[PDB]
Amino acid sequence: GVEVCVKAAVGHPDTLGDCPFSQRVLLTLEEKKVPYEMKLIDVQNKPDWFLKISPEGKVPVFNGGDGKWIPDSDVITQVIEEKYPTPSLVTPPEYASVGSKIFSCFTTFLKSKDPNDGSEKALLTELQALEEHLKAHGPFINGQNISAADLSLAPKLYHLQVALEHFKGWKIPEDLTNVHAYTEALFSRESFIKTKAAKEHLIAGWAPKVN
Ligand code: NA
């Protein structure tokens, strides 16, 4: 049936790595109960067969059983949605951008070596917006049922929490209680547990970037 190429853990080509875009695709397949074959790609040592179907070395790529491999996890989860419509993970267009600046604010703050450059405040602003959304519309981004936006956001919040605690001793404030309820719900899902990177691999993936 379907096949997906994802990043292997750095230093461990036999082990699932920490790409949040890869994990979004995997989470989507798991939540939809779609069988798939997973191919681990060492992105510092790509195989030539891989380069023939992904010439720019892009990961993830997805083959839905129609004789081609497509990149871009936005595009891939939409194709999966169209081909496997039940369970429905459609997120209403009015909530599509919820949480959309959190990952980049996180990466800027993670890499920041200046306590006064405002990167921390910018990240807290985006977390607070997520908190306000979940307080109005939760427990997931679209209310009682999980949807595509949650599966996009959860791998990203996982990086945020693991990397900021490890490298900066920083945690999401406890008063953001809806965000904490949200991450605890998502990260405890069997699909998430099955598809997440071990924390030491995720940390090893960020270490040279921090650095
Ligand atoms: Na390579």
Author numbering: 2 to 212
From the manuscript:
DHAR catalyses the reduction of DHA to AsA using glutathione (GSH) as a hydrogen donor before the spontaneous hydrolysis of DHA to irreversibly form 2,3-diketogulonic acid. To expand our knowledge of the underlying molecular mechanism of OsDHAR activity against ROS, high-resolution crystal structures of the apo-form, AsA-bound, and GSH-bound OsDHAR were examined at 1.9, 1.7, and 1.7 Å resolution, respectively. Structural comparison studies revealed that Cys20 is a catalytic residue and that Lys8 directly interacts with AsA and GSH to reduce Cys20.
Here, we present the first crystal structure of OsDHAR. Most of the residues were well-resolved, except for the N-terminal methionine residue. Notably, OsDHAR was found to be a monomer under both reducing and oxidizing (10 mM H2O2) conditions. In the apo-OsDHAR structure, the OG atom of Ser23 is 3.4 Å away from the SG atom of Cys20, which is an acceptable hydrogen bonding distance considering the rotational movement of the side chains of Ser23 and Cys20.
